[PDB]
Each structure stands twice: as structure tokens, then as C-alpha cells.
């Protein structure tokens, strides 16, 4: 009804917020006030990967820190050897409107998806010597935004129909469905323990989901526009988001509130990707103004600029050993930075 | 590269070069096709336009792809009517199509919206056309405007005058003037007349000449691309 319901809930919103104001003793900017800066971060382009013929929409690193996969909207998934710039596999897609791709932690499978509302799983270790479509997961009524492997037989996807799904690859059926967002979900990130994951949606909100039970644990607000990217802190106790309001934010799971804001008066374009370095001291973000910005995650200071792309930067990645960074743009090039 | 590589490294480089060759061949083949984006609003007649070429010439589904061939030219048409999500999150995926086909039903001027009883269907199609034409991703993309159901419009114009819509219309209330007036209001929404064109056809012609029209409207567009590609502009 309209009485004792949808109004008492507004009281609860006044309680949680109050509980969020009694835990804010100090701020992150004051705790890290008397610590040394990181200086100026200068990175050079070591490799340039050519061979795509349209805009690159997604990329993902392998767990060996040498092989990577990229997806272009010309119907191609390309697997690159980054040390020698050799092409290992070129997979033609049935639908060219791809918007996400993933690499299995074992290295035996890749995943793809896009405007066809289907997640395709490709096997890379066949006895026939070719890459063949292993599975096609269907059931989403909106476009596929992101997908991440949990193991060889589990995957989590986010869709534009305001939902997330945990699948069983061997059976092809949805195992768990996560609902509660108002707008389209645009990104997800798996925790290092795999037991939790965060998602950011077009309703300017992020949510934390427990995989093994399927219920929402916490909701985080504070942005003013759509959240386009999300990433976990290395220890799995915090995460970072990038929005369309030209701002990145850092949220803490245990503190249940926002910690730091990364924004500049010069920057007015949206943010497409975010990433952390191995220690978590640096935060790397990709922007629509063709540049990548490296922020000091503890002092909210812009430490560096990566500028080598003629169009907007659409995807970012940092290897597991923390050696190099990979950037992919709306031109047809991927760049490795050291 | 050179003599510092091993035998297996040389074989891997050879495989990479073969992959590059195949990629270039695929890109060259794909550059010769004509990609069209099909748009409309409600009962505009998109199914009738799609049925103009039923030959292949070669959960909820998101995008429907249709292939056909006319005069040794290959067309791929993309229908995105199924997509019920936020359009601004994926419209930029279609930046670079050859043209946008936009279907509008002429007879949808007396009827009003089902949910919004006090909203006109023609007005809704006009708002959609205004949003698409002046979009930031379609600055130099041409639009082929299809106006369907002229046979029903020429009969509905008798019982009901063209005053329920267009309150400032002063005309003879015949088909030959009302249709030309509607085309003028649809073409007046273009604010990029120095970079894009609108091609209008009354596609209640039951024959196949409709695709013929598209062919012509495509050829001109391609010419205007080459003039910019070759530096003339």
C-alpha cells in the first residue's frame, strides 16, 4: 500500500545514513596527510598491437601475464602474445556487435557477448587444431555488458535488462539470478576470493553480491551519473568506480561509505575504465578525451598521463605480476606501457 | 626477428603472417557491403519494408540482421526494435553505417497513443526523428525516410481533416497536398543540411521498386563519400 509501506522505508534510509555518520571519525585525506608523494610517473610505449580494423571494445589479460584477448566490432576476437606481438588465434564471431570478452584463469576458454543477448564460450584446446564454439548461454533479455569466469564451469554476466546471472556452462542453465538494480548494469568485478562481486549500474549505484547465496549485501551511492567501470582493491576490502560525471570514487566494504574522490576541474569527459596497480597505490583510469590518467590512490593527486591514442580509450588492463599496462582505444590499436 | 630466432619462433611468425593476410582479406571483403540501420516507432510498417527482400542472398533476441543482394550490391540491414534498454548506451555502436532507414506510417495521424491517450502517434514519430537526426553520432549520416500506408491515408483524409494534427494547417484537405505538407514538416527537423541529406519515398507502392529506390539513394551517398575520400572536397 501507500501507507506503512514505501514511507516507513524512507525512515530506514534515515537510519543507515545516520549509522554512516557515526563511523566517519576522520577522512582518508587526513590519515594519509603526512606521507611522501609518489613523484611523477612516466611510462613508455613498448609494444603496439595492430590487426583490428574497427573500434576495440574490450580486452582481458591471461593469468600468465603474457597472453591477452581483445574484441573488435568487426567480428573478431584476437589472442595476442604480448612479448613478440605474434597473433596466436583469430576467432570470427557470428555476431559482430560484441561489447565484452573474458579469459579463463586456466587458459582453456574464452568468452564473448554483446547486442545479441548471448554469451558465447569458445574452446581453445581442441584436438582438431581449431577454435570452436563450446557453448551458447541464452536467457538475458538485454545486451551483455560484462562477463568474468569463476572457473572452467562457472561464469557471471551482467545485462542491460538490469540483472546479473551466474551460469552453469556444462548444462547451459542459469544457476543464480541477481536482481535489484534500476538501470542497466554496465560492469562487474570479482573479488580475489571469488566469494563476492560488485556491480555498477546506470542508476548511479553500486551493489555487492554474495555468489553462493544470491542476495544483495550492501549498496553504495554518491555518483551523479551512470557508472561505467568498477574494480576491486587488491586485498578485496575496497573498490573503485568511474562515472559519466568525470569522477572516480573509492568505496570501503567495512566502512560502508565513500573514502576518496578523484576529479579535476580540467577534466569534464566521462570515464570508461578503471584499474589498480599490484600494490594498490596507483589508480589508472581511461577517459573520453583520448587520455589515460594515473592517480595516487592515497592522496587523490594526478601522478601521470598516458597519451598515445587518437580516439577515446575504451579498455584498460594490468597484469597479475604488475609489470605492464594495456590500453585499448576506439581506433584499431592496443598499446603496452611500462 | 632475424637470425636470433629459433625454428619454432620462425614458424610462429609465419603463422602470424598468415593470420594477418586472412584478416586483411576479410576487411577488404567487408568494406564492399552496404550497412543500413532500420528505425521506426510502433506500427510504422517495418515488417512490410523488411519483407521487400525475403531471399537470404548468402531469452530475447537483441538485433535482427537481414542480408540481400540487388544489382551485384550486398546490403545488410540491422533492426534494433527488440532492444528495450537505454539507447544512448549502444547507439554509438552504429556510428559509421552507410545510411539510416526511418519508417513512418502516414495513417498514424488520427490515432493517439494507447498508454498516453492525449499524445499523437505522428508527434511521437517526429520526436524520434528529431532525436535521431540531430544525434551527435550521426552528423554525416544520411536518412532514407519511408512514408508507408498512403492508401489508407488517402481514405482517412476524407472522413477526418488534417486538423487533429497540425493545428496550423490551411490546405485543400486532399492527399496530394497533405502528404507534401507532412513531408515538409518531417524534412524541416534537419539542422545539418550542409552535411547530410534526407531522401523521402512514399512506399505504399506494392511493387518491388522500393528496393530500387534504396539502391539509388545508396549510390548517391557512396559518391559523396568518395568525393571526401579522394580529396576533391
Amino acid at each position: 500500500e501507500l501507507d506503512q509501506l514505501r514511507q516507513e522505508a524512507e525512515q530506514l534510509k534515515n537510519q543507515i545514513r545516520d549509522a554512516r555518520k557515526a563511523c566517519a571519525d576522520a577522512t582518508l585525506s587526513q590519515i594519509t596527510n603526512n606521507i611522501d608523494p609518489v613523484g611523477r610517473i612516466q611510462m613508455r610505449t613498448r609494444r603496439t598491437l595492430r590487426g583490428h580494423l574497427a573500434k576495440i571494445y574490450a580486452m582481458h589479460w591471461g593469468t600468465d601475464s603474457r597472453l591477452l584477448v581483445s574484441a573488435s566490432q568487426d567480428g573478431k576476437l584476437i589472442i595476442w602474445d604480448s612479448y613478440t606481438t605474434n597473433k596466436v588465434h583469430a576467432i570470427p564471431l557470428r555476431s559482430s556487435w560484441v561489447m565484452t570478452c573474458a579469459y579463463a584463469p586456466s587458459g582453456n576458454y574464452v568468452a564473448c557477448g554483446g547486442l545479441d543477448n548471448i554469451c558465447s564460450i569458445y574452446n581453445l584446446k581442441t584436438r582438431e587444431g581449431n577454435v570452436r564454439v563450446s557453448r551458447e548461454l541464452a536467457g538475458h533479455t538485454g545486451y551483455l555488458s560484462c562477463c568474468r569466469f569463476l572457473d572452467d564451469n562457472q561464469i557471471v554476466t551482467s545485462s542491460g535488462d538490469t540483472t546479473c546471472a551466474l551460469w552453469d556452462i556444462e548444462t547451459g542453465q542459469q544457476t543464480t539470478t541477481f536482481t535489484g538494480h534500476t538501470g542497466d548494469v554496465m560492469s562487474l568485478s570479482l573479488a580475489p576470493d571469488t566469494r563476492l562481486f560488485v556491480s555498477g549500474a546506470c542508476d548511479a549505484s553500486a551493489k555487492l553480491w554474495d555468489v553462493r547465496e544470491g542476495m544483495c549485501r550492501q549498496t553504495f551511492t554518491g555518483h551523479e551519473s551512470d557508472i561505467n567501470a568498477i574494480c576491486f582493491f587488491p586485498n578485496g576490502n575496497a573498490f573503485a568506480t568511474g562515472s559519466d560525471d568525470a569522477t572516480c570514487r573509492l568505496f570501503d566494504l567495512r566502512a560502508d561509505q565513500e573514502l576518496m574522490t578523484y576529479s579535476h576541474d580540467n577534466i569534464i569527459c566521462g570515464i570508461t575504465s578503471v584499474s589498480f596497480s599490484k600494490s594498490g597505490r596507483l589508480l589508472l583510469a581511461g577517459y573520453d578525451d583520448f587520455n589515460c590518467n594515473v592517480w595516487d590512490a592515497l592522496k587523490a593527486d594526478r601522478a601521470g598521463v598516458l597519451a598515445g591514442h587518437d580516439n577515446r580509450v575504451s579498455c584498460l588492463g594490468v597484469t597479475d605480476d604488475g609489470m605492464a599496462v594495456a590500453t585499448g582505444s576506439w581506433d584499431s590499436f592496443l598499446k603496452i606501457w611500462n | 626477428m632475424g637470425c636470433t630466432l629459433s625454428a619454432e619462433d620462425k614458424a610462429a611468425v609465419e603463422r602470424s603472417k598468415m593470420i594477418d593476410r586472412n584478416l586483411r582479406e576479410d576487411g577488404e571483403k567487408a568494406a564492399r557491403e552496404v550497412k543500413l540501420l532500420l528505425l521506426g516507432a510502433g506500427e510504422s510498417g517495418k515488417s512490410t519494408i523488411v519483407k521487400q527482400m525475403k531471399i537470404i542472398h548468402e531469452k530475447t533476441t537483441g538485433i535482427v540482421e537481414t542480408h540481400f543482394t540487388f544489382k551485384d550490391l550486398h546490403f545488410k540491414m540491422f533492426d534494433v526494435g527488440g532492444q528495450r534498454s537505454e539507447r544512448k548506451k549502444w547507439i554509438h555502436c552504429f556510428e559509421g553505417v552507410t545510411a539510416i532507414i526511418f519508417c513512418v506510417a502516414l495513417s498514424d495521424y488520427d490515432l493517439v497513443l494507447a498508454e498516453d491517450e492525449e499524445m499523437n502517434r505522428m508527434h511521437e514519430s517526429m520526436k524520434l526523428f528529431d532525436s535521431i537526426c540531430n544525434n551527435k553520432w550521426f552528423t554525416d549520416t544520411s536518412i532514407i525516410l519511408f512514408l508507408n500506408k498512403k492508401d489508407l491515408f488517402e481514405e482517412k483524409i476524407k472522413k477526418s481533416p488534417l486538423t487533429i494534427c497540425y493545428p496550423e494547417y490551411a490546405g485543400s484537405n486532399t492527399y496530394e497536398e497533405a502528404a507534401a505538407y507532412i513531408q515538409c514538416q518531417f524534412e524541416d527537423l534537419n539542422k545539418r543540411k550542409d552535411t547530410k541529406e534526407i531522401y523521402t519515398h512514399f512506399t505504399c507502392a506494392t511493387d518491388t521498386k522500393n528496393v530500387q529506390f534504396v539502391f539509388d539513394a545508396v549510390t548517391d551517398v557512396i559518391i559523396k563519400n568518395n568525393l571526401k575520400d579522394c580529396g576533391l572536397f
Partner: single-chain antibody
Amino acid sequence: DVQLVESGGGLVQPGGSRKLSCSASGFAFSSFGMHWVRQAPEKGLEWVAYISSGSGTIYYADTVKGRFTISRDDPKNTLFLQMTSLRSEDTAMYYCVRSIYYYGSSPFDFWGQGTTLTVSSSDIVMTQATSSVPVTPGESVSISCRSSKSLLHSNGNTYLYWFLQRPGQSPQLLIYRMSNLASGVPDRFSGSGSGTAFTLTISRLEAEDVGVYYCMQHLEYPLTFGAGTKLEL
């Protein structure tokens, strides 16, 4: 089911010509490089010829160069070896081998059944130094291979391969690049070594694992095998 079937062998007179055919079924024949290998009666293995994927690279052994020609027909999935001026040193049993080359691949992973040819009538040296050992089931044994040149390249790879040939069958891959275990091979097998000396451990023995073990190098394209270590009883 991967299958390679070889045909064209028979009794030939000293001097003459003969063509051997290798038909492949069950895999992507065009993506694999192909090798012709031979085994003399009661002798070891000997690499003969190699043709790349796409026919862009061809190699011959020094003992058959100028008289042997290797070719492939990819639409028909066939490999041909044309041999002319046959001597009494060419009577052997010939095997067709497939091998693919990219990062992390497993070359030399499948061999054919072989065809018998009978005539009426600096290269790296690989030493095994042991021709026969007695083994019993349940025990553990070791096989040693020695090279005349360091097989470790300046990229981290040591190119050494191990093959097992059971009585009456064709060789099969066990270990590639001195450490990796081939698909469908029990975990009992292991390999380890320095740049010059290498060791293969069988762990527990069974009714299987009885036959001849060979070590091969893949650093310089003139490919050489060991003498072969025999495991009896």
C-alpha cells in the same frame, strides 16, 4: 577421430621413382605443418622432410636433397612425397607426422601407421649411450640423453622431445620441450635436465611402457634422433 593413412609402398628396383601419399581425416589439415620421417629395418628414426602450413617453407635432409620432393594438396587433405633415383639405403618404413607451431603448442603430437618401401638392390649429435636395460613392473627407471650442443635458447626454452615406440606400433609423444607432459599421457612420466644432459623418469612400470624410447632435438632444423633405449621384460 584424428587419422593419417599412408599408401604407395612396395618393392622397387635400384633407380626409379615412386610417390607416397598421406591422407588425413578428422582435423584441420591446412593449419598443421607436415613431416616425413623414416625408420630403417631394425634401426632408429630419421627425419626426412618438412613442409610448412601454407607451403611457404620446405626443408630436406642432406641425404635426400635433390631427389625427394614434398608437396601438399589442402582442398583434398593429402600429402605427397615424390622420390627419384632410389638407392638401397631408402628401403625403410615411412611415417607422416603433423605438427603445429604457436606459443604453447605441442608439435609432433600425432604419427601415422607408416608404409613400407623396399628397394631390391654441423648437425647436432644426440647420444643415448644405453641400448637395453632390464625392468620389472612396480620399480622405477631412468633414461639419459646427451647432446653435443646446448639445446637451451636465449628465450627460456630447451627444445628436447621424448617419444615411445611400442612393439608393432608407431611412435607417440611423451614429453615436449623437456618438461611438458603431452595430452593423454599418465603422470608417471617426468622429464628434467640441464642444457646438455637430460633425464626421463618412468616411475612405476606396467605391461605398457615396454619398447624403444627416443630423444629428439628441435633447435636447428636438421632434426636428429637418439639411438633408442630398449626396455625389456
